[PDB]
Amino acid sequence: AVDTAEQVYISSLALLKMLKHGRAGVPMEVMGLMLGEFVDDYTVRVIDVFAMPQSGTGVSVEAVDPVFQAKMLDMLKQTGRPEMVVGWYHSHPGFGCWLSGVDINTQQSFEALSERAVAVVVDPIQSVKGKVVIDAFRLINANMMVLGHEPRQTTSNLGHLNKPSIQALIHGLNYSITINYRKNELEQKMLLNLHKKSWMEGLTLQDYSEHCKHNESVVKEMLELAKNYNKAVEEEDKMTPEQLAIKNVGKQDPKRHLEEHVDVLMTSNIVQCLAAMLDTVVFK
Amino acid sequence: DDIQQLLKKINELTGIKESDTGLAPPALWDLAADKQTLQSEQPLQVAR
Amino acid sequence: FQRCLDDHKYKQAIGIALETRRLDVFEKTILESNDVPGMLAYSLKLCMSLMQNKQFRNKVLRVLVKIYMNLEKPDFINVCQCLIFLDDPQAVSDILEKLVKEDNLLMAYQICFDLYESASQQFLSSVIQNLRTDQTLKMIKILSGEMAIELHLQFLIRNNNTDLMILKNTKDAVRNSVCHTATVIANSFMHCGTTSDQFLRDNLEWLARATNWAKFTATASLGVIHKGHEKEALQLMATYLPKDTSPGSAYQEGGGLYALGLIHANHGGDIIDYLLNQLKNASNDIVRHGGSLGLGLAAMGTARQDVYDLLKTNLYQDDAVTGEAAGLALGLVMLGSKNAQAIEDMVGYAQETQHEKILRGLAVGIALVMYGRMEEADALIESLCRDKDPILRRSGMYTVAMAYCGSGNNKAIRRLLHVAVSDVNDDVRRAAVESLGFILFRTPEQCPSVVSLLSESYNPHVRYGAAMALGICCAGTGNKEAINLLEPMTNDPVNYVRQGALIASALIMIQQTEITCPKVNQFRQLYSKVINDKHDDVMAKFGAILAQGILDAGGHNVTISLQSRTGHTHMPSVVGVLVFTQFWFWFPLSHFLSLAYTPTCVIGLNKDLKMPKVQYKSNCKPSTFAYPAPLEVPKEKEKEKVSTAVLSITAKAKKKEKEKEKKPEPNFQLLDNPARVMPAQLKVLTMPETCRYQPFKPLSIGGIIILKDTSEDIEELVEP
Amino acid sequence: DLYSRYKKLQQELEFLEVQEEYIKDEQKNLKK
Amino acid sequence: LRQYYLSKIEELQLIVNDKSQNLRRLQAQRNELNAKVRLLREELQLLQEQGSYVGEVVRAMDKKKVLVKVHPEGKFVVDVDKN
Ligand SMILES: [Zn+2]
């Protein structure tokens, strides 16, 4: 009857489907019901999720049109499993990861249907590059008045890292259910450099004429770095060394222009020679 | 110089305040000047 | 060798023999000139410290016991310790039979005392069983440790000088944040077995405001507070039967069972059957947890098949909290055993299940199911460290930890550091360092260096780590090095990092005033400020309050040390430190810190049972002790005034008018008989010859020491 | 004594070796 | 056995020191390269928080209230931080 630091496990395919469906319709807002298993009192797991065609004025109680809701969950069991509906996609393109009054009105009914169901919010715009803004939410009970501070409890266990975000504070806040991604070893065997490994392209020698031009392009400016290094080596002649050696700006030589260049030149000129000589004996 | 530097302290600590007017005295309608206001908010969506 | 003998310097001979596996020359060096008849003591120390290969250490120590038996007057203490380490119940029974035949009562009583101080049940249990199969009755009673329980409980009560002003200050500064359990846990730690818990008795709205498992905190807080009262503990529980007002508060009954089980921590009797029946028939879900965590403690080390079956049946009945409770109970029930089938079944189920709490606890349960085998764990450690499930990997790390507790094994440290550098999961990354101390503790000199680097790394989840790692390494001593290292660590922007750091510091400076580390006051003031502020991290303040509560334990009498004064490691203390180190996964388990409290007292028992009065004195030069704790002032001052700044020509008139108007310490004091003696002075105290008796046992240790019996009709025959 | 010193230094050499590897592993990981 | 027992102690003492200062060198640059993994790491988090607006203040009202004037939009009665 009380929440805690509870972990929601979303499958890798589930996350991928969330992101793809969200980005497909970024200008609008999308909705997608979630299927999963109610593991135990502190572990709600969703194995796969399914989308609901973009109809209505938007995310609302219209996404649960029985004609479509029943027929998919049905055919889906025929092949696979019945994992009971546990949550919903939802999606806020440029609105952070907040929940609005309409969203609360919606999730109220879903909470009624279940007892602990969850509402996800996947941001398809902000989340790019190496960011995932997928935050999970639950409806604080209407008995707010006076009670043990929030239903969070957090007295059972200390899992609380990744404290609340910024925008949710501004908008309605105080749940922020913690989210942990499951990854089967096989599921990551693929989706790995199977996505980009190389295949057999290491034994490629690189355009030789190109190499002899890149090497000159790099060494010629290594010369300029050497001139600058001489200039900076005449420096430190006891005028204001401690302060000056640190206050001198200009990408101090042996840290950004004489070290990185040497490291790149070494790697390139050595990999080329190794490949060349390896092929000199692999093929006859 | 001490007098010149003292005037600055005096006005700094007695700075321009009590100018944030715009508040009717929540005494004439003090009773309604309360949760009734919140009831006014929330419902009654602001139109355009 | 003959050359060395000619040199007559036989220390080199003993060392070379012990290295070269020449037991012949080893026996010779002692059978030969026993110059410095403490050479036996040197052999003991150098064989119990700088020796690792158990296959040879056991042989060397057998030879040592042979020489000791072969001397004119065998040394009771040395023989008892050596037998305790050999685990030879038959030898112990033989020696007790021989002594009872000879009737050397002082040696007999001291032997029983030291045995119950050092060995573990199933060794004392074997001795008692053999002796069973009138004086013998008294010897068995003492060996069971019940008389010791009464004696040292009496000590704890009779020095129950606990403070409460800090308790009230924390009450006042405690908001409705999680600090409720923090204060309750501080009280529980303070009053460990003191039988004096008045604040909760006077006030009840606060101790009543909690939730299902918030209530589970107070029950076991009470249970700890009343450690060691097996006489009427069942009566106390019955007085707190759940059906007093309403049977719907199952949390209360589970907690009460938990408290009772801890109260019998490492003791059973009809309570074992009571708990067995209660678990067999009880409420549905939470009551199972209370029964399980009670049984686990009550049978801790017993390794009884019937309780094992009960716990097995409980666990294979999946449930969110019941599963984890049962897993822990199983681990405790079969500790230091290596039951092949036990490990097989436990590990298999850990693999099979899917509720991430039953296995969350089964990890520690399995890791505990084997203790300090020191070699017999490699199979399990490798098998678990190769697993896919991160929880099971953590479990394997804990098992590789306790399997080598008390030893500085190079391969173990290698494996732990490797896992802490090159793992993927944060729980594993932490458990790595957190379990590092359990191995680099017995010689807390190198853990400073072994931690001095990693304590500054990017991943705060792994920096927490060294905090508790040091906290356990330098547990009973304020090395003053961990103090320097952790001083900034109390100021990291990672709230949980500091939460760990504060508790580690508190354990590090436990009961030690500025004699060890001159910064105890600074750290306590820091803790007070951190608890005071309303803007500091909530869990950080929880950690700080836990540190404050654990700072002084049992009214400044009980300390933390995994090893006996003789150096024998204490299964309950080590298990408690491990269980607590499993802290920020389940707050309720925090009460296990009780088991690791080592009472610091001296018992000058003279009669069979009497505790004759004496007045010792101390002569320590540089160090005080014994309750400096000047915290005896309300320190409630308030000025609310403004200082003048009048500065004009009037200063001259003020000056002219003013002219016109104006024209014992401790370290050499005495001490009572059953008075706390800190280990810092257990070796520099003073022999009070005034009274009529003297302690036949050498006086460099603590613990109960039976004195020589002189003529009767002495003065002050008091037995409070 | 003269053998205890040797035993102490043997153990200490072992424990320093057991760190000269951990530091290097951490260095590799931190470079990554 | 002063000829030998002392022979071994030096044979395993001078050498073992070289493994003492070596530990610092490995310890020294570790922290330094730890500096880089922070001086360049924290910059990313503190580069992804929404920027600030530029405005002109007018007639600081009663303490803890001001009247700024944003560029495109109107004047807002903004608060004042604790610093
Ligand atoms: Zn929405």
Side-chain angles (χ1 to χ4, degrees), chain C residues 649-663:
Chain C
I649 55 160
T650 315
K652 151 176 272 310
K654 320 179 221 145
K655 179 72 182 204
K656 65 92 183 172
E657 59 87 17
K658 200 51 208 59
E659 176 267 11
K660 151 67 215 74
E661 191 262 339
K662 81 183 173 60
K663 93 192 299 179

PDB file of all heavy atoms in Angstrom, chain C residues 649-663:
ATOM      1  N   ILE C 649      34.832  62.425  18.669  1.00  0.00           N
ATOM      2  CA  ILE C 649      35.684  63.108  19.628  1.00  0.00           C
ATOM      3  C   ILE C 649      35.380  62.637  21.038  1.00  0.00           C
ATOM      4  O   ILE C 649      36.213  62.790  21.936  1.00  0.00           O
ATOM      5  CB  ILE C 649      35.521  64.637  19.529  1.00  0.00           C
ATOM      6  CG1 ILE C 649      34.050  65.029  19.689  1.00  0.00           C
ATOM      7  CG2 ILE C 649      36.076  65.150  18.209  1.00  0.00           C
ATOM      8  CD1 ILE C 649      33.846  66.475  20.088  1.00  0.00           C
ATOM      9  N   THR C 650      34.205  62.050  21.254  1.00  0.00           N
ATOM     10  CA  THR C 650      33.812  61.617  22.588  1.00  0.00           C
ATOM     11  C   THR C 650      34.726  60.534  23.137  1.00  0.00           C
ATOM     12  O   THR C 650      34.690  60.265  24.344  1.00  0.00           O
ATOM     13  CB  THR C 650      32.366  61.117  22.577  1.00  0.00           C
ATOM     14  OG1 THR C 650      31.549  62.025  21.828  1.00  0.00           O
ATOM     15  CG2 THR C 650      31.828  61.009  23.996  1.00  0.00           C
ATOM     16  N   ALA C 651      35.529  59.898  22.288  1.00  0.00           N
ATOM     17  CA  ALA C 651      36.453  58.891  22.784  1.00  0.00           C
ATOM     18  C   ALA C 651      37.400  59.481  23.817  1.00  0.00           C
ATOM     19  O   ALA C 651      37.763  58.813  24.790  1.00  0.00           O
ATOM     20  CB  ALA C 651      37.235  58.279  21.623  1.00  0.00           C
ATOM     21  N   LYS C 652      37.822  60.727  23.620  1.00  0.00           N
ATOM     22  CA  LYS C 652      38.731  61.338  24.580  1.00  0.00           C
ATOM     23  C   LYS C 652      38.069  61.498  25.938  1.00  0.00           C
ATOM     24  O   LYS C 652      38.690  61.232  26.973  1.00  0.00           O
ATOM     25  CB  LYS C 652      39.212  62.689  24.062  1.00  0.00           C
ATOM     26  CG  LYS C 652      39.539  63.681  25.159  1.00  0.00           C
ATOM     27  CD  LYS C 652      40.103  64.968  24.581  1.00  0.00           C
ATOM     28  CE  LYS C 652      41.612  64.880  24.406  1.00  0.00           C
ATOM     29  NZ  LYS C 652      42.290  64.408  25.644  1.00  0.00           N
ATOM     30  N   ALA C 653      36.816  61.947  25.956  1.00  0.00           N
ATOM     31  CA  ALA C 653      36.104  62.063  27.221  1.00  0.00           C
ATOM     32  C   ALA C 653      35.921  60.698  27.861  1.00  0.00           C
ATOM     33  O   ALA C 653      36.035  60.555  29.082  1.00  0.00           O
ATOM     34  CB  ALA C 653      34.754  62.747  27.010  1.00  0.00           C
ATOM     35  N   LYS C 654      35.638  59.679  27.051  1.00  0.00           N
ATOM     36  CA  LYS C 654      35.515  58.335  27.604  1.00  0.00           C
ATOM     37  C   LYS C 654      36.815  57.898  28.258  1.00  0.00           C
ATOM     38  O   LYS C 654      36.808  57.347  29.362  1.00  0.00           O
ATOM     39  CB  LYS C 654      35.103  57.341  26.519  1.00  0.00           C
ATOM     40  CG  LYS C 654      34.066  57.857  25.540  1.00  0.00           C
ATOM     41  CD  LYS C 654      33.744  56.812  24.483  1.00  0.00           C
ATOM     42  CE  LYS C 654      33.607  57.437  23.106  1.00  0.00           C
ATOM     43  NZ  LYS C 654      34.120  56.533  22.041  1.00  0.00           N
ATOM     44  N   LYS C 655      37.943  58.140  27.595  1.00  0.00           N
ATOM     45  CA  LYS C 655      39.227  57.732  28.153  1.00  0.00           C
ATOM     46  C   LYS C 655      39.542  58.493  29.434  1.00  0.00           C
ATOM     47  O   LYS C 655      39.989  57.902  30.425  1.00  0.00           O
ATOM     48  CB  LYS C 655      40.337  57.937  27.123  1.00  0.00           C
ATOM     49  CG  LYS C 655      41.719  57.552  27.623  1.00  0.00           C
ATOM     50  CD  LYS C 655      41.869  56.044  27.739  1.00  0.00           C
ATOM     51  CE  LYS C 655      43.238  55.668  28.283  1.00  0.00           C
ATOM     52  NZ  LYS C 655      43.634  54.285  27.898  1.00  0.00           N
ATOM     53  N   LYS C 656      39.324  59.807  29.435  1.00  0.00           N
ATOM     54  CA  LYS C 656      39.598  60.585  30.636  1.00  0.00           C
ATOM     55  C   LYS C 656      38.716  60.132  31.791  1.00  0.00           C
ATOM     56  O   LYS C 656      39.190  59.983  32.923  1.00  0.00           O
ATOM     57  CB  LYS C 656      39.403  62.075  30.363  1.00  0.00           C
ATOM     58  CG  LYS C 656      37.977  62.461  30.026  1.00  0.00           C
ATOM     59  CD  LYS C 656      37.208  62.874  31.270  1.00  0.00           C
ATOM     60  CE  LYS C 656      35.758  63.191  30.946  1.00  0.00           C
ATOM     61  NZ  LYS C 656      34.951  63.419  32.174  1.00  0.00           N
ATOM     62  N   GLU C 657      37.431  59.891  31.523  1.00  0.00           N
ATOM     63  CA  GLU C 657      36.538  59.436  32.578  1.00  0.00           C
ATOM     64  C   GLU C 657      36.921  58.051  33.072  1.00  0.00           C
ATOM     65  O   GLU C 657      36.826  57.779  34.271  1.00  0.00           O
ATOM     66  CB  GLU C 657      35.092  59.443  32.086  1.00  0.00           C
ATOM     67  CG  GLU C 657      34.840  58.574  30.866  1.00  0.00           C
ATOM     68  CD  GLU C 657      34.534  57.133  31.230  1.00  0.00           C
ATOM     69  OE1 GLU C 657      34.201  56.876  32.407  1.00  0.00           O
ATOM     70  OE2 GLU C 657      34.628  56.257  30.345  1.00  0.00           O
ATOM     71  N   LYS C 658      37.339  57.161  32.171  1.00  0.00           N
ATOM     72  CA  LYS C 658      37.752  55.828  32.592  1.00  0.00           C
ATOM     73  C   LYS C 658      38.985  55.900  33.481  1.00  0.00           C
ATOM     74  O   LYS C 658      39.061  55.216  34.509  1.00  0.00           O
ATOM     75  CB  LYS C 658      38.019  54.950  31.370  1.00  0.00           C
ATOM     76  CG  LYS C 658      37.980  53.458  31.656  1.00  0.00           C
ATOM     77  CD  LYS C 658      36.702  53.072  32.386  1.00  0.00           C
ATOM     78  CE  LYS C 658      36.910  51.844  33.258  1.00  0.00           C
ATOM     79  NZ  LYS C 658      37.967  52.063  34.283  1.00  0.00           N
ATOM     80  N   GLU C 659      39.958  56.727  33.106  1.00  0.00           N
ATOM     81  CA  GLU C 659      41.112  56.913  33.974  1.00  0.00           C
ATOM     82  C   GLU C 659      40.690  57.481  35.322  1.00  0.00           C
ATOM     83  O   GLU C 659      41.184  57.048  36.369  1.00  0.00           O
ATOM     84  CB  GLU C 659      42.135  57.827  33.312  1.00  0.00           C
ATOM     85  CG  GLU C 659      43.312  58.144  34.208  1.00  0.00           C
ATOM     86  CD  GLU C 659      43.114  59.423  34.989  1.00  0.00           C
ATOM     87  OE1 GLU C 659      41.982  59.948  34.989  1.00  0.00           O
ATOM     88  OE2 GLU C 659      44.087  59.901  35.607  1.00  0.00           O
ATOM     89  N   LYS C 660      39.778  58.457  35.315  1.00  0.00           N
ATOM     90  CA  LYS C 660      39.336  59.060  36.568  1.00  0.00           C
ATOM     91  C   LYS C 660      38.653  58.038  37.463  1.00  0.00           C
ATOM     92  O   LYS C 660      38.860  58.031  38.682  1.00  0.00           O
ATOM     93  CB  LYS C 660      38.396  60.228  36.289  1.00  0.00           C
ATOM     94  CG  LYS C 660      37.382  60.463  37.394  1.00  0.00           C
ATOM     95  CD  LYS C 660      38.054  60.946  38.671  1.00  0.00           C
ATOM     96  CE  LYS C 660      37.355  60.399  39.908  1.00  0.00           C
ATOM     97  NZ  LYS C 660      37.640  58.955  40.132  1.00  0.00           N
ATOM     98  N   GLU C 661      37.821  57.179  36.879  1.00  0.00           N
ATOM     99  CA  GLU C 661      37.151  56.147  37.662  1.00  0.00           C
ATOM    100  C   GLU C 661      38.145  55.124  38.198  1.00  0.00           C
ATOM    101  O   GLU C 661      38.042  54.695  39.352  1.00  0.00           O
ATOM    102  CB  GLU C 661      36.081  55.460  36.818  1.00  0.00           C
ATOM    103  CG  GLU C 661      35.155  54.565  37.621  1.00  0.00           C
ATOM    104  CD  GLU C 661      35.560  53.107  37.553  1.00  0.00           C
ATOM    105  OE1 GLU C 661      36.283  52.732  36.604  1.00  0.00           O
ATOM    106  OE2 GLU C 661      35.163  52.336  38.451  1.00  0.00           O
ATOM    107  N   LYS C 662      39.117  54.724  37.376  1.00  0.00           N
ATOM    108  CA  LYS C 662      40.054  53.676  37.757  1.00  0.00           C
ATOM    109  C   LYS C 662      41.181  54.171  38.656  1.00  0.00           C
ATOM    110  O   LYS C 662      41.952  53.349  39.158  1.00  0.00           O
ATOM    111  CB  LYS C 662      40.645  53.025  36.504  1.00  0.00           C
ATOM    112  CG  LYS C 662      41.782  53.809  35.873  1.00  0.00           C
ATOM    113  CD  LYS C 662      42.271  53.144  34.596  1.00  0.00           C
ATOM    114  CE  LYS C 662      43.297  54.010  33.884  1.00  0.00           C
ATOM    115  NZ  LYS C 662      44.493  54.266  34.734  1.00  0.00           N
ATOM    116  N   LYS C 663      41.294  55.477  38.872  1.00  0.00           N
ATOM    117  CA  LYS C 663      42.333  56.017  39.737  1.00  0.00           C
ATOM    118  C   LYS C 663      41.787  56.308  41.129  1.00  0.00           C
ATOM    119  O   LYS C 663      42.474  56.890  41.966  1.00  0.00           O
ATOM    120  CB  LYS C 663      42.932  57.286  39.133  1.00  0.00           C
ATOM    121  CG  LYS C 663      42.265  58.567  39.601  1.00  0.00           C
ATOM    122  CD  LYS C 663      42.704  59.759  38.766  1.00  0.00           C
ATOM    123  CE  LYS C 663      44.200  59.993  38.876  1.00  0.00           C
ATOM    124  NZ  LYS C 663      44.638  61.143  38.037  1.00  0.00           N
TER     125      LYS C 663
END
